[PDB]
Design a binder for this molecule. Structure first.
Ligand SMILES: O=C(O)[C@H]1O[C@H](OP(=O)(O)OP(=O)(O)OC[C@H]2O[C@@H](n3ccc(=O)[nH]c3=O)[C@H](O)[C@@H]2O)[C@H](O)[C@@H](O)[C@@H]1O
Ligand SMILES: Nc1ncnc2c1ncn2[C@@H]1O[C@H](COP(=O)(O)OP(=O)(O)OP(=O)(O)O)[C@@H](O)[C@H]1O
Lengths: 639, 106
């Protein structure tokens, strides 16, 4: 047949050779920079390439040009995806280093040693949308010797693969292959191991620890531990069922260097202190200062604009956990006064444009900064564009810079408005284009400002190591989303403005028909997701942009007005307010002034949220409507 | 700058020749054609040819581009009574000549 190969490292060479010996014609080989696959390719006169992303249109089109019958993947590191895979009529097969569906993850060579398996093997399966799930075309078992280590098991596997391909490859050349599907309810998956995963925890059994040192023995990074401040690596181990009433982690002897484990002791045969040379355990013991003795505050969150809608709710949330200390500054304090007595809450009434000593000192002193000061009520974009620009953009750019100056993590609040009039069904943080209108449509000044800030934060991240996370709220609402008073000037979001209407007995106006829709998110859902981001479990939020909204609560403004009215009519306090003045369609210009333009639909992709936070919106819209309505109605003084 | 009749106040004006639309590939050909006919041609090495490349390998990660760009020159006509005149090929020649005579030959 005619094929295009994706190979790298050892398996890559033996695979390209088996492929050649089997009579295949290799049109091209895709590999990586740094047995060299490239060297082999060059030696055999096979055009070799090493782009960063072969999934790029140009490559896909060029691979399609070669018109391959089948595609093979022998330890290719980057990920080849569907688009190109299906360019081969005979299919695409990948050679995985484990007994699938077991250890279908990555680094199976090491994991099988970590978990101390008795056997492993090689598997040639078909490539499908799911990683390592495709139908198995051939497999082959391998026995793991009690004294095998990563490198030695690697050759075992290489040899096994050389044999598996040797015989099952001629089979594919023709078509005698059985797609024995994978027993999905038996598949095990593992992820990339970082050198921090080879840490030795002496409380575990000597056996477990021993397999660890084997799993990552040279040429791998190795298993390590600490002698006080000093870090050392264990290259050779040796389990001793020889008990020792000694507590785990304590040195039983220095010749041999025997450490007491949770079960039995482990003998460090060879290792090295720090980046020094390898030496026998007895010597390593001395160079580390060992004798018979044992081996191996809360988070400050700064919230600017803490009294705001997002601010006060986030404070309540954080103040529930004990590992948080909350520092906040704001112009107002009615929403956070209830926390003033809390020991872990430190509030101060200030202005981001005036109180520099406090702000700078705290960005310097805290661990995470949440710059929530802003003006986010659309009427203000057209009415006071410059005030919006100066506060939303300039004032914040200053905080962003304090953060890079003092190397602090910044969880900056982006906005769903950054997508503008995007046309995708789902506004995607990593793929959607951003669309705004002409310069003569000033409503977008906000959108554009927030986007430039997102881009600056991104550059700082890329070019200066700033640790960040951008989050984009999608029409969050609930109690304290603005206030009826600000609403009297149009300075508030829809929901809270329509409540003022029902309260004062004025009609609910639906700007341009009110057919445009949005995805309303309950503030409780939003704060939970945000809380998760602050938690930043596993650092899965670094450099990430995360939308937060409930795609399930999509509704037109007209529907929002109806749902609100329905609740309002059933409310206990209803009789206190005037009779409904009705819904009335109005030209946007008559409410927002010249220069207004809007978004016809807004629904978020919440994939990233699911991936980084394991978050999912839960509260349904109607409930949010009730909560919000109730809060504001009981804000009205009745006398 | 003249702002005759203040017809440019508060105006945004595109300035381009919608008549000179061309792909970069065509720009490269037109340039090459002129280059081959140029008096100074013999001073420079033989053409190494055209080669398609991934944007990433030239601009780095994070590059994206514009597939087409043509301006409306209504405002220009209305506020300035202006209309592009020079054709692209002439601009190519001018530019090529200038830069070729920028090269020190010795
Ligand atoms: O939280 C959100 O995701 C976004 O909310 C607002 O922007 P937007 O949703 O466009 O505007 P709202 O004031 O919340 O109202 C939505 C739409 O309802 C309509 N509306 C509003 C008020 C009213 O009385 N009548 C009416 O028909 C308007 O067309 C308005 O654009 C903010 O401007 C954004 O910064 C924020 O990201
Ligand atoms: N100059 C300023 N100095 C300090 N705080 C300010 C200043 N200007 C505005 N603020 C504060 O910013 C806070 C946050 O704004 P607000 O609550 O109106 O919206 P938000 O919660 O960010 O809304 P969304 O989440 O919908 O964008 C306000 O409570 C206000 O006190």
């Amino acid at each position: 047949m005619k094929t295009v190969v994706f190979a790298y490292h050892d398996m890559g060479c033996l695979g390209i050779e088996a492929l050649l010996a089997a009579g295949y014609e290799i049109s091209a080989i895709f590999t990586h920079t740094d047995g060299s696959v490239a060297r082999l390719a060059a030696e055999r006169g096979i055009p070799v390439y090493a782009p960063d992303n072969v999934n790029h249109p140009l490559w896909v089109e060029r691979i399609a040009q070669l018109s391959p019958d089948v595609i093979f993947s022998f330890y290719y590191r980057h990920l080849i995806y569907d688009e190109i895979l299906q360019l081969a009529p005979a299919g695409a097969f990948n050679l995985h280093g484990s007994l699938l569906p077991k250890y279908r993850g990555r680094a199976p060579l090491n994991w099988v040693l970590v978990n101390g398996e008795t056997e492993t093997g090689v598997t040639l399966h078909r490539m499908v949308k799911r990683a390592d799930a495709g139908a198995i075309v051939a497999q082959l078992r391998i026995a793991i010797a009690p004294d095998d280590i990563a490198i030695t098991l690697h050759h075992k596997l290489c040899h096994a693969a050389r044999q598996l391909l040797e015989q099952t490859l001629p089979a594919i050349k023709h078509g005698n292959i059985l797609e024995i599907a994978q027993r999905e309810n038996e598949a095990t998956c593992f992820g990339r191991r970082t050198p921090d995963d080879s840490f030795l925890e002496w409380h575990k059994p000597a056996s477990v620890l021993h397999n660890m040192v084997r799993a990552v023995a040279d040429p791998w990074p190795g298993a390590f531990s600490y002698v006080g401040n000093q870090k050392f690596t264990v290259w050779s181990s040796r389990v001793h069922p020889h008990a020792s009433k000694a507590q785990p982690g304590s040195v039983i002897s220095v010749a041999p260097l025997l450490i007491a484990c949770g079960d039995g002791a482990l003998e460090i045969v060879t290792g090295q202190a720090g980046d020094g040379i390898t030496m026998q355990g007895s010597q390593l013991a001395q160079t580390l200062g060992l004798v018979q003795g044992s081996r191996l505050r809360r988070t400050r969150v700064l919230i600017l604009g803490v009294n705001g809608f997002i601010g006060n709710h986030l404070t309540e949330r954080l103040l529930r956990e004990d590992h948080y200390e909350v520092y906040g500054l704001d112009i107002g304090s009615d929403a956070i006064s209830r926390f003033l007595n809390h020991p872990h809450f430190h509030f101060v009434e200030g202005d981001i444009s005036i109180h520099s000593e406090w702000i700078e000192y705290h960005v310097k002193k805290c661990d995470v900064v949440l710059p929530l000061v802003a003006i986010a009520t659309p009427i203000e974009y057209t009415r006071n564009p410059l005030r919006v620009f100066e506060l939303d953009f300039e004032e914040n750019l200053r905080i962003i810079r304090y953060c890079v100056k003092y190397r602090k993590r910044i969880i900056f609040p982006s906005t769903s408005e950054v997508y503008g009039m995007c046309s995708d069904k789902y506004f995607d943080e990593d793929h959607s284009n951003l669309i705004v209108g002409p310069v003569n449509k000033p409503r977008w000044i906000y959108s554009v400002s927030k986007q430039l800030l997102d881009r600056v934060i991104w550059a700082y991240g890329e070019k200066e190591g700033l640790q960040f996370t951008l989050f984009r709220p999608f029409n969050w609402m609930g109690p304290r989303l603005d206030n009826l008073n600000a609403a009297r000037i149009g300075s508030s979001r829809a929901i809270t403005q329509l409540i003022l209407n029902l309260v004062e007995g004025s009609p609910i106006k639906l700007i341009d028909g009110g057919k445009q829709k949005r995805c309303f998110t309950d503030i409780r859902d939003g704060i939970e997701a945000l809380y998760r981001i602050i938690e930043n479990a596993g650092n899965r939020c670094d450099g990430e942009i995360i939308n937060i909204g409930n795609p399930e609560n999509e509704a037109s403004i007209e529907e929002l007005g109806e749902m609100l009215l329905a609740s309002f009519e059933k409310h206990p306090l209803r009789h206190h307010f005037p009779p409904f003045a009705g819904f009335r369609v109005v030209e946007s210009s008559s409410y927002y002034g010249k220069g207004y333009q809007d978004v016809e639909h807004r629904k978020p992709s919440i994939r990233n949220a699911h991936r980084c936070l394991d978050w999912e919106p839960k509260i349904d819209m109607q409930e949010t409507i009730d909560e919000t309505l109730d809060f504001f109605l009981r804000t009205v003084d009745l006398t």
